[PDB]
Amino acid sequence: NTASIAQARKLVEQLKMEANIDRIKVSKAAADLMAYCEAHAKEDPLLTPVPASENPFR
Amino acid sequence: SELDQLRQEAEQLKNQIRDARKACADATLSQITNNIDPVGRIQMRTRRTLRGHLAKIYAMHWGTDSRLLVSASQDGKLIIWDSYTTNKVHAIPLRSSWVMTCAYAPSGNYVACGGLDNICSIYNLKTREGNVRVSRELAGHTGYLSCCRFLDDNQIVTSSGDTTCALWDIETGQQTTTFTGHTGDVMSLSLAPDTRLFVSGACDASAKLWDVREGMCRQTFTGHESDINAICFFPNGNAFATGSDDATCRLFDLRADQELMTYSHDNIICGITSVSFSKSGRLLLAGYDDFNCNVWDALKADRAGVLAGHDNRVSCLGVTDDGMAVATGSWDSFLKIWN
């Protein structure tokens, strides 16, 4: 299994595909998340409760 | 020795990946979200109580109409509820008692479920004659079915205790693609919103990103210290959240290829069974093994709410596509709808 030469080679070729992707700064990734949340918070019933009127469970 | 050569080459490649990631860590999510306003507290209270299952509940799924949901129980049945009325629409005796997961398809035409039988079974809801039968038995896995999600009415994706995930062609029952790479039982999967990628969480404490169509693993996230039991995409396909026996949920960014946040507290010790984001992503809800569901603020990490009306484990939960509601299902035979 790990005695397998084919398995060791498969593994190495995988870590290759994973080592060679494009990355972005976290600073960046964090902003786009924050952005999304703002863009859609007025659309999100759990974030800001809407009155009995529209909510089906009352 | 060439076997020895490949062992180092994989060791140095993990280092290459470790350094490449640190090189992107120029800032934290917690820094970047420091001045945006809190959420307040989330007044969430039981609305409906879905009464029926005669034993522990293991799993549930909302239909896309944000109204129906399927649930799966130790009692050997699926139950399809209309949550507005609490009326059972269908009750389904399974052929194996050892069911463990279930899924409502997006069209509302089919559900799937499975478990210790190592099979994903597709049930059809309205046939020509108009009654509920097994339309397929997707066999091929060599270990329990842990989770399953439809892409549409003819393809479905499953995860298993055999450490693989798989893609199926329902019309022919063929196992068209096979996703290997995990080294422990796979527990949970989540589909991206485009359905071209999905993520898996496993008992090897690693989660993985997969490409549906090309059949390979694009990315591996780690850092949990224990079984990942649950996984869910952030509503924009660019990150996901995981829950684990380590008593923490985490947020991993896809494009930064790494962990952004831990959600945890010193006085929470039980493991997590289930995770879901609210519609906008701000709220991360987690079902816990101390009988509660927690609402976290995804962006800040502060604990923001509690859902507490179950006398046993919250095994599963779910938010509707319309953001209006949360199901929690429990080892105490009950589902509850909250808002």
Place this chain on the structure above:
Amino acid sequence: KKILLPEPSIRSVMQKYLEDRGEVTFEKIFSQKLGYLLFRDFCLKHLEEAKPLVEFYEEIKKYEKLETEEERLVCSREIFDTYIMKELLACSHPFSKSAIEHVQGHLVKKQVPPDLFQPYIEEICQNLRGDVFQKFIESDKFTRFCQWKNVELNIHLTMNDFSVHRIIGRGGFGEVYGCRKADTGKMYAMKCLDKKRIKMKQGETLALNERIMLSLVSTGDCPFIVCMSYAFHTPDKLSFILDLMNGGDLHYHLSQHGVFSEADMRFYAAEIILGLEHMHNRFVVYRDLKPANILLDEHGHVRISDLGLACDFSKKKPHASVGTHGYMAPEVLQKGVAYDSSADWFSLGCMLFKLLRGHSPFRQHKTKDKHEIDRMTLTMAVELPDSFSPELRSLLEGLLQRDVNRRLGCLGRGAQEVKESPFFRSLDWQMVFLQKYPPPLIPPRGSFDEEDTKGIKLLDSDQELYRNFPLTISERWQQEVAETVFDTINAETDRLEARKKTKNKQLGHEEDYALGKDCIMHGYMSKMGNPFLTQWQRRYFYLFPNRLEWRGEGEAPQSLLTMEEIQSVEETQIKERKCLLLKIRGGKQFVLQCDSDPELVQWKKELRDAYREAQQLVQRVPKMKNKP
């Protein structure tokens, strides 16, 4: 208080009870009386392939029983033309060339013995053993089998199961009454031994032994031994249910009538021999053969009764001196000196002597001198009155010859040697067996009691020796039932069922709950409900691999236990009623009472099996196991 079959649901538990035990084979079921009865009702009526074979089995069976040679030529022709020739003429003979060639050749040689078609018997069996047998098991007829077996395996008898009548016999340890088993009507003797009177005279082995001896010789349906159908007890009494003989014993009748002629003695000796054969064939010696242990039935035929002093020689053979005094052989009386069949043959001699000439040949002139009768039997043969014919003379000296290896019966062919004596030259031995000979004596139609002797105790250490006395002889019970209530109970129960199926295509509830899933076993049990009250409620249960569900009549199940919850499963007593005690995780307890011993046995077994597997399974499934 008549027999009541369980409902057919009983099939779920019984088919598994039997299967665990290896009993669902053609061999085991076909050789049971009610088993054969049901399997053939199935073949003849509910399957056109098997009908021929069974009809053929039966014609051959009837053929074996024909008495005359005249009758067998006529019949063998009929059978061959009907079940063999005609079948070949239309290419549907599934039998050996060997089997046809056996018969063909005998018939044209006009040869017709009762075992003529024996080789078809094996081959008809092989033709039924396979597909027909499996299709039988599919049928409602095997359901009916399970229903009748549930009753068999659930028999527990008490004096109340019998309507006891008047005294017909008595000895040291108790009395025999005649009686009627209410169940079925069947008439029987009931022997009743007082346990206290036993303890005192200190013969528990002796009571125990009679039961064990009865149980060795009681199959076979032998007309010349008084056999056992059941045995049970109470705190106070042992009970044997034996063949009813209400014509008294020979001792009485001998003293009544006087001594017997030779032709009249010829009759008693025949019938007695056949019983001896039977016992000897089952490796049993009687040892106490004497006129008083020969009972006459209502017409005059006799039987050997009372196996108290009998003994098994299938392994160790007896050495010790046992029996009455002028009937004990030499090898008997020599302690240390072993023996077997030998002594009966001797006794027979003394016994037959005594019927002709009024006293044991070794009881000289009214003497009541044990050690005299002993010592003369040891080393002196007897001038047999000049009046005995040569043939009787020959017989008696054959039987009484002191040396075991020059004595009749004990020269390696047994009863056969005795049947060949000139004394029985005139007898046809199948007509003796069939009781077709006229008995000399027809018993004519209709303060011995026990003073309360001893204030003795009956301990837990006493009642432990009789732990294994209770028993039922299956072949007896089935035979009893076959010929009394079997048909009327079967049709009554057919109606009871066919009506309830009609009432369910009305009242809604049909589509069967157990079917289609992974249900392991279902059936009725009762639980306590009301905790503060504790009365039993009967429900229908369903065992799945990870839970136990039940429901009342009408609505589907609304309660259960999980195999996960269950920690242990053990027997317990409630109201002197054996129940199952389930201990549950909370410290809680759950009590189950089943309706018959097989059900208790199987529910205990499958529950234990289910929960052990469920727990070993669940602790390798992260989403199912308990976490710390």
